[PDB]
């Protein structure tokens, strides 16, 4: 039927002659994980190849595609494709290798693989946790240059399809599309790359509850020290100290879960401003206590509400509100 | 006996003609793990295939099935089946491949595999930790469409059997059953899928002890500040502050172990309401202290139990109890 | 010598006739790990098979066993055995497959494998950390029923031997023995199972130091509040609050390391009783403070050691000691 | 040249006759890791075998060794060796299997493998973190007894060489040497084992900084309560309570990182003695406060520095210093 | 075309004669990870080999290189290369083995592999986190000595090329270059090694925010105790105690993430000096309280700002600033 034993398949079709066209269709099954510290993502996809090989021609009367077991794959020539800038990947093998082989009577061949790929994606956290990130997956031939193999999307924009169940708990996925670009290696020649592009957006709610509310609550807990009688030194001092230390703990806990980036994120700006306010509260009380002591000493040697508290009760909330307005007008 | 060398098994029985019927029996051995963060499960099952192949016919006098070693499997045609929407799977191989092959004199073949499959399961945590989840395992042919291969359950509802030792420490497993549905791929044709469905329910006790009791205890520890003399400012302030901070720590610890979902869970509602109560206690004491200071200043310039404490001692417990009644009437 | 090329080894000896006897010897090399959360164990063992095959007969004059390389194994019939209710296992392969093959002149064959098996073991933690657990390893044929293959222990009780270096840092291992039982599958027939049983016991010392001493110390630290003058409210309140919060932290830390079981363990009983005592201390001080305030108000309007402290100093230690006596008489 | 096709290599040289001598040389490349909780170590080594086989003889004129590709290895007889009491091991395979084969004209064969072995090592932590541990790697034949194969060190003591780059960040490695001993299996016969022995010693500095300094600092922080005026009850009570709780946290953190051993380590002795001192400080202050209250009551009914503080200021430091002297004279 | 069946490729070209030259080109694709605790790095690279073999000569008219499938590789002789001092490595295999084979009509052969290598790198942390580290990758032949195979860089310095996307989030990568050196094994002979060298530098910002700012803030929070009236003992004591304990927690958290090195790092110097300052603050207050008590007792028996506070308010900040100036002038 196929006369496999009569041919040497160590050479591509057209060997010694013009390049062989190869078309690609991709269907994305899922996006399994995203790792900010590792700066990568894991995708499961169906990779489909189209090419023609006269050596697989067989007689028939119905002009219909016929399906073979898939162990025949290792006896015939198959296009060499690999994922560029990946960290690890594999082909699923239960209950058998998830490999399809269909051959038409005139030699047209359809080849399909189910693979899982972990690939690198460089992300900019300068607007975290309000950032928008983009990632891509690159498909390129390994052994054959553009002189031997021509790689292209089979149906252009319509070659990429996605399952309706693609979802992430933290990220919104949008704008899947495909592009084509060339690549050059100084010692091997020119290669043709295929691209799968998509965009990711975060949900802010979780970060609000984890960071922004606790810091605001710690700032507001430092303003009750302005309504307590200043004669209660052992009540007013520990309150401010505890609020400062809790703010420090919040900052450390927030920074613990992110990659060790050399630049400043928006959450760092917010937390450090809140910390500054909490610190200023303690300094303000220390000034008040010192001035009261000075006045007592002067009065005895010569023999109400302090203005600082009265003005702080107004100044601190207004400054904090203005800061919040400007911050959330800039970062939105 | 079998004349394997006289036939080409690269083509299915009936090649070029009508589709070949294939029956499936499944026996579930165990459910090994469930991962909320990964949103998958691991199952170990016995997969059994039934079909007929005249090319394996042999003479006999007893009309009995004969068992072969299993290395013969790779010399004959075997149905191509794979698990859909899986993450990883394998066939056990100790001390040999766990593969059974039995052939009847008239060509009927029984084929059995022991496999372990990790498969995806989308779960809704909107009622966590009082949620009920459902999952499924899908069996579909890879290479052959419904025109070449007809896939069905061998005995309908009786095709699925479960071992009595299937058990999870946290989940209750119930309602195993099977269904059949078709699937369509735009470039390859129609396929016939088999389904194994089951339902999972959580045990609430662990979550009660981990989250609900500590938060209630922290709320109740904030009500002892209403029975302490209000003149003890350095005793009443740190108590409320410590309770608020402990409630915050509880909220963070509860959220740490779950997937980063964009929606609200019931435990979040309970914890945030408890946090609100604890915060209000501190605000109440601050109001009491301020009013006492105002009265002292007025009396000196002109020259018991405060009503707020007296009413709070009644109001706070009743509101908390009513909230608990409504919450546990809604979520049950 | 062996005339391997002259025989088809795809059929068992006696094919079509009576069942072939197969004897098993097992020597346990080590117990590598136990996982409470995974509920499994890992064992390394030497598995030895005994059977007769006339097709391997060769002429000789000394009636002595001869050893072959082990690549011959894949050319001859070998009994099909697998481990039941396992999670994963493999055969060691350095520097070659650890497989022995010895054939006697009359056809007697000895076969030996070095394997590592991870197997499930259901454990009851209702008496943790004073529990005693039992586990078993099951050996059964996969392809052949009791009509084709008879599986038995070669020397009965003497078939199981253990290395003197089997040891676990936390568990005491005792009472290795073997049993035999039949198994039935509704669609394949009856099989004969072999069992390896052993018993595990914990060492209590580690758990004493981790849980029982800290909780008792936290309870005893709450009784120093009964010897401090009750006029020191800001000294007596934070002490009780801190002890309650530390007890809560201890409970959470203890529960963190165990599987999410739906039932109550002994350590939970001990910790919750200790927590109750610590909570009652705080309530007792609140009552004392309130009564003192009431008496002061009455005396002013009309114009030592409080009995509660005096009785608590006796009542609390005696109740705690009685609880310890009963607890350690019940759980031993 | 080698006439491989003319011989059956399923039988050892000398099959049916006297045992074949096999010499072993080992060169250690690195020690990769040590795990106290797993009680094992990982070593990378070069394993070299020497034997003679007349079936590989070839004509030559120069009496020189000739090197072959290494795919020839699987066509000839190779000694069967494995590592005893190992957990996992493998042969490196990039860019090809790291296997050397050299054959001399008279049949002498040199065989070399690069392997990585993880092996068990039982360690005694009774003097931790001042302990000295010893470990060994055992090489034994699997299939052949001492009647068929004689295993020995090729050059005795000079057979073991080590790379100068063997180093661990925490451990000092010394005293590599080799020994030989026999082993007996009740069902297979006598085997000859080869041993590689070495000694490990810890660096104390890290443990000093992690445990011993913090505990001493916490003990010294409890002695400042003896210089504060005893009238400051709310200052002296929380200090002692906080020091006790911090010591408890230190003990838990120290125990967290070690295996769950049933016996007592030296660090446990040191930490528990320090804890006892810190606890006694709190009890001492409670006694002082009670006695002051008694004296006040007696004086009123009838109508400086307390001796306990004065003696404690001397007694506590001297006892702690004596304990340190004895502890560091015993454990060195 | 190639007459593979007519030659034995178990012997290198020139077998029995002069050494065969082999050239190497390397292109680095990425640096995937660096592990301080494991002391290794992971690199993905393209390894290219050049050699001549007359046995692969074929007739042609165009003097052009022809590309073969890559399954031919296992039928011909291929140079034996491996990575020295590696921990693990593999060749990527999707969708096929990423192996290129190109043969010129005169027998010149180009061979290319895509591999991932994890290799050891000894690092000195004595200047952490201001350290600069160097690492190298070593390529050496395994089976063949310099008498049989001559290994060299194909284009010298121009043989090493790097992708523009090589980047690490924490480290700056610079100065890629190549060197050549010989290696000697006492039992096998001389080998020729190739080296790939590069330099790594850290970004200080992350460590500043994680360690240096919190410790400075904790030191500055201990200087507010010098502006509070010394009569407030219960306010001034807990402040110093809390600052000391927080500094201890910072030290432990900093040390937790690094390898257990026996020497001192710069961050340890900074943290321990800050801890000393914080401790001295508490000792200073204790001295002040004791002296005040002594003066009170003397005055009663005979019947402002203390100088220590006044001098400490100046001395502590100046000493801390001088320490910072010297530290950051030494470590830069
Ligand atoms: C298949 O090819 C035949 C001619 O060989 C043609 O008549 C028929 O229409 C074709 N069918 C399809 C579906 O292309
Ligand atoms: C899709 O393809 C069409 C036609 O080739 C092109 O105009 C369009 O820009 C493409 N869209 C994207 C997102 O690449
Ligand atoms: C097997 O087939 C024979 C006829 O070939 C029939 O007589 C016999 O009853 C059958 N046995 C079973 C169990 O079906
Ligand atoms: C089982 O099969 C019967 C008959 O086909 C059907 O009536 C019933 O609904 C099925 N049950 C389930 C759970 O699918
Ligand atoms: C081996 O068999 C021979 C007879 O073939 C007998 O004489 C001899 O005693 C036997 N030896 C053993 C050890 O069984
Ligand atoms: C061991 O075997 C003997 C005899 O078969 C039996 O009496 C005994 O009960 C067995 N012991 C165990 C532990 O099974
Ligand atoms: C090799 O053997 C020959 C004799 O066959 C001898 O003359 C020569 O000295 C030997 N060389 C070595 C290095 O042993
Ligand atoms: C090394 O070998 C020599 C001679 O065989 C022996 O005297 C010595 O004790 C050995 N050393 C060790 C450490 O085994
Ligand atoms: C190839 O070799 C031929 C001679 O065989 C020569 O004429 C031609 O210039 C060469 N081409 C290249 C590119 O080296
Ligand atoms: C590169 O090679 C040139 C010439 O061989 C040499 O002078 C130079 O030092 C080399 N550079 C490095 C970094 O090895
Ligand atoms: C998606 C925005 C949510 C804002 C909630 C306050
Ligand atoms: C908040 C600062 C107030 C200053 C009044 C003079
Ligand atoms: C917001 C409070 C203002 C008080 C001014 C006296
Ligand atoms: C299954 C419900 C248990 C409830 C315990 C209070
Ligand atoms: C004095 C009784 C207080 C109760 C608080 C729950
Ligand atoms: C008494 C009201 C205080 C409000 C502080 C936010
Ligand atoms: C709890 C609020 C009480 C208000 C009384 C006027
Ligand atoms: C529950 C306590 C109520 C007190 C009312 C005065
Ligand atoms: C094995 C029992 C030990 C008990 C130590 C108090
Ligand atoms: C003064 C002795 C107190 C004892 C508390 C356990
Ligand atoms: C501990 C309770 C004492 C009650 C005395 C009336
Ligand atoms: C154990 C102390 C008892 C005190 C009774 C007055
Ligand atoms: C190796 C001993 C070091 C001791 C440092 C105090
Ligand atoms: C005032 C000196 C106290 C010393 C405590 C270690
Ligand atoms: C430290 C104990 C002192 C006792 C004096 C009577
Ligand atoms: C070390 C201080 C001793 C004080 C004795 C009065
Ligand atoms: C690269 C140096 C940054 C310094 C920021 C204060
Ligand atoms: C850093 C302490 C400053 C205090 C000013 C009152
Ligand atoms: C900071 C030390 C001051 C000493 C004055 C006598
Ligand atoms: C920096 C404050 C100095 C005060 C000297 C009296
Ligand atoms: Cl206080």
Contact partners, residue C11, CB within 8 Å, separation at least 6: B68, B69, C77
Tell which phi-psi region holds residue B39, choosing left (phi > 0), alpha (psi between -120 and 50) or beta. Answer: left
Which of B262, B276, B283, B287 best tests the A interface by mutation, with the highest count of A CBs <10 A?
B262
* Residue B112, marked binder: yes
Terminal Cα distance for chain D, rounded = 67
Q: Which two tokens stand for residue C77?
A: 């019939």
Residues on chain A touching E242 (C-beta within 8 angstroms): 241, 245
Residue located nearest, by CA, to atom 10 of ligand 2: A157
CA distances from B320 to B311, B326, C143, E193 (A): 14, 10, 64, 76
Question: What are the two backbone dihedrals, phi and then psi, of residue A80, each rounded to the nearest 5 degrees?
Answer: -95, 110
Chains in contact with chain E (at least 3 beta-carbon pairs closer than 8 A): A, D
D80 in C contact zone (CB under 8 Å)? yes
Residues 126-185 of C with CB under 8 A from D: 161, 165, 167, 169-170
Nearest to C252 by CA among C201, C209, C214: C214
Long-range pairs, D1-9, Cβ under 8 A, ≥24: D1/D58, D2/D56, D2/D58, D2/D72, D2/D103, D3/D55, D3/D58, D4/D72, D4/D75, D4/D76, D7/D55, D9/C69, D9/D55, D9/D75, D9/D76, D9/D77
Chain A: list its partners (3+ Cβ pairs within 8 Å).
B, E
Distances (CA, A) of D93 to C272, D96, E72: 57, 5, 19
Q: Is there a contact between E227 and A39 if contact means CB atoms under 8 Å apart?
A: no
What is the SS3 assignment for D230? coil
Q: Hey, which chains touch C, using 3+ CB pairs under 8 Å? A: B, D
SS3 for chain A, per residue?
Answer: CCCHHHCCCCCCCCCCCCCEEEEEEEEEEEEEEEECCCCEEEEEEEEEEEEECHHHCCCCCCCCCEEECCHHHHHCCCCCEEEECEEEEEECCCCCCCEEEEECCCCEEEEEEEEEEEEECCCCCCCCCCCEEEEEEEEEECCCCCCCEEEEECCHHHHEEECCCCCCCCEEEEEEEEEEEEEEECCCEEEEEEEEEEEEEECCHHHHHHHHHHHHHHHHCCCHHHCCCCCCHHHHHHHHHHHHHHHHHHHHHHHHCCCCCCCCCHHHHHHHHHHHHHHHHHHHHHHHHHHHHHHHHHHHHHCCCCHHHHHHHHHHHHHHHHHHHHHHHHCC
The HSE-up count of residue B45 (CA atoms within 13 Å, CB side) is 26
E48 labeled binding residue: yes
Q: Are C137 and C195 spatial neighbours (Cβ–Cβ below 8 Å)? A: yes
B213: preceding bond cis by omega (within 30 degrees): no
Cα–Cα dist E320/B311, whole Å: 53
Q: Whole-angstrom Cα distance, residue B75 to residue B77?
A: 7
Q: Mark which residues 3-22 of C lie under 8 Å from D by CB.
A: none
CB atoms within 10 A of CB A174: 10
Residue E247, both tokens: 């500094």
User: Which of the listed residues D154, D156, D157 should we mutate to test ligand 8's pocket, taking the one with most ligand atoms within 8 A of CB?
Assistant: D157
Measured CA to CA, the distance from residue A289 to residue B241 in angstroms comes to 23
Interface residue B286 vs chain A (CB under 8 A): yes
Which of A78, A98, A187, A285 to probe by mutation at the E interface, max E CB count within 10 Å?
A: A187
Classify C69 as helix, strand or coil: coil
Whole-number Å distance between alpha carbons of B308 and B289: 11
Question: Is residue D113 less than 8 Å (CB to CB) from chain C?
Answer: yes
- Please say whether the beta carbons of E70 and E82 come within 8 A: no
Question: Which stretches does DSSP call E strand in B66-158?
Answer: 66-68, 81-84, 86-91, 99-103, 108-120, 132-141, 149-153
Q: Say if CB A46 and CB A114 are below 8 A apart.
A: yes
Inter-chain CB proximity B227 and C188 less than 8 Å? no
Q: Which of C12, C39, C82 is the closest to B94 by Cβ?
A: C82
Task: Count CA within 13 A, CB hemisphere, residue C321.
Answer: 5
Rounded CA separation E125/E271 (Å): 16
- Alpha-carbon separation of residue C83 from B100, C37, C86, D30 (angstroms): 15, 22, 6, 36
Cβ atoms of residues C178 and C157 within 8 Å: yes
CA distance C139 to C317: 56
CA distance C312 to C225: 10
D16 burial (CB, 10 Å; 0-12 / 13-18 / 19+) is exposed
Alpha-carbon span B106 to E293, nearest angstrom: 109
Residue E163 has phi, psi (to 5 degrees) of -75, 145
Q: How many CB atoms lie within 10 A of CB E59?
A: 6
Q: Are B287 and A228 contacting, i.e. CB atoms less than 8 angstroms apart?
A: no
Burial pattern A49-74, b for ≥16 Cβ within 10 A else e, equals: bbbbbeebbeeeeeeebbbbbbbebe
Burial of C17 (0-12, 13-18, 19+ CB in 10 A): exposed
The two three-digit tokens of residue B233, written as one number: 């400012």
Structure token digits, residue B182: 């078709």
**Determination approach:** cryo-EM
**Which value, in Å, is the radius of gyration of the alpha carbons in chain C?**
33
Is B68 in the C-facing interface, judged by CB distances under 8 Å?
Answer: yes
CA–CA dist E269, C27 (Å, integer): 56
Tell me: is residue E140 an annotated ligand-binding position: yes
Q: Which ligand is nearest to the CA of A310?
A: 13
Q: Are E229 and E309 in contact (CB under 8 A)?
A: no
Which helix (H) or strand (E) element contains residue C27?
strand C20-35
Contact E26, E47 (CB under 8 A): yes
Joined tokens for residue B154: 């061998």
Min Cα–Cα distance to chain D from C49, Å: 12
Q: Does A257 lie at the interface with B, CB-CB under 8 angstroms?
A: no
- Secondary element (H or E) of residue C297: helix C266-302
Instruction: Name the residue at shortest CA distance from atom 3 of ligand 27.
Output: E205
Token pair of E160 as six digits: 């090493």
CA dist E15 and E147 (Å) reads 11
Shortest distance between the Cα of E296 and any Cα of chain D, in A, equals 10
- Bridge-based pairing state of the strands E108-120 and E86-91: antiparallel
Q: Which long-range contacts (CB under 8 A, 24 or more apart) does D271-274 make?
A: D271/D211, D271/D215, D271/D247, D273/D323, D273/D327, D274/D215, D274/D216, D274/D218, D274/D219, D274/D247
CA of B204 to the centre of ligand 14 (A): 7
Q: Which of C330, B255, D278 is nearest to A208 (CA)?
A: B255
**CB atoms A115 and E94 under 8 Å:** yes
> Are A168 and A34 in contact, with CB atoms under 8 Å apart?
yes
Q: Residue B117 and residue A94: Cβ atoms within 8 Å?
A: yes
Task: Determine the Cα–Cα distance for residues E227 and E309; give it in Å rounded to an integer.
Answer: 8
Residue D290 CA to residue C227 CA, distance in Å, equals 6
Nearest-Cα distance to chain A for B143, in Å, is: 5
Report d(CA C10, CA B293) in Å as an integer: 99
């Amino acid at each position: 039927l196929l006369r496999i034993d009569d041919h040497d398949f160590s050479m591509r079709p057209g060997f010694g002659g013009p390049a062989i066209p190869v078309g690609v269709d991709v269907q994305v099954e899922s996006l399994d994980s995203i790792s900010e510290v590792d700066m990568d993502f894991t995708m499961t996809l169906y990779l489909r190849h189209y090419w023609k090989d006269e050596r697989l021609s067989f007689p028939s009367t119905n002009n219909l595609s016929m399906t073979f077991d898939g162990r025949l794959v290792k006896k015939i020539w198959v296009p060499d494709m690999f994922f560029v800038h990946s960290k690890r990947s594999f082909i699923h093998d239960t209950t058998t290798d998830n490999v399809m082989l269909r051959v038409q009577p005139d030699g047209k061949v359809l080849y399909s693989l189910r693979v899982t790929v972990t690939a690198m994606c460089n992300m900019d956290f300068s607007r975290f946790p309000l950032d928008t990130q983009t990632c891509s997956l690159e498909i390129e031939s390994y052994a054959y240059t553009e002189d031997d193999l021509m790689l292209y999307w089979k149906k252009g924009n319509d070659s990429l399809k996605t399952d309706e169940r693609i979802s992430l708990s933290q990220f919104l996925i949008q704008e899947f599309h495909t592009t084509t670009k060339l690549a050059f290696y100084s010692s091997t020649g020119w290669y043709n790359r295929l691209y799968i592009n998509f965009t990711l957006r975060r949900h802010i709610f979780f970060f609000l509850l984890q960071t922004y509310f606790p810091a605001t609550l710690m700032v507001m807990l430092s303003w009750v020290s302005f309504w307590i009688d200043r004669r209660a030194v052992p009540a007013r001092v520990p309150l401010g100290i505890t609020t400062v230390l809790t703010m420090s703990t919040i900052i450390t806990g927030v920074n613990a879960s992110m990659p060790r980036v050399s630049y400043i994120k928006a959450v760092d700006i917010y937390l450090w401003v809140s910390f500054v306010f909490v610190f200023l509260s303690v300094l303000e009380y220390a000034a008040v206590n010192y001035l009261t002591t000075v006045q007592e000493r002067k009065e005895q040697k010569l023999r109400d509400t302090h203005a600082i508290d009265k003005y702080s009760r107004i100044i601190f909330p207004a400054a904090y509100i203005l800061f919040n307005l400007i911050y959330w007008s800039i970062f939105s």
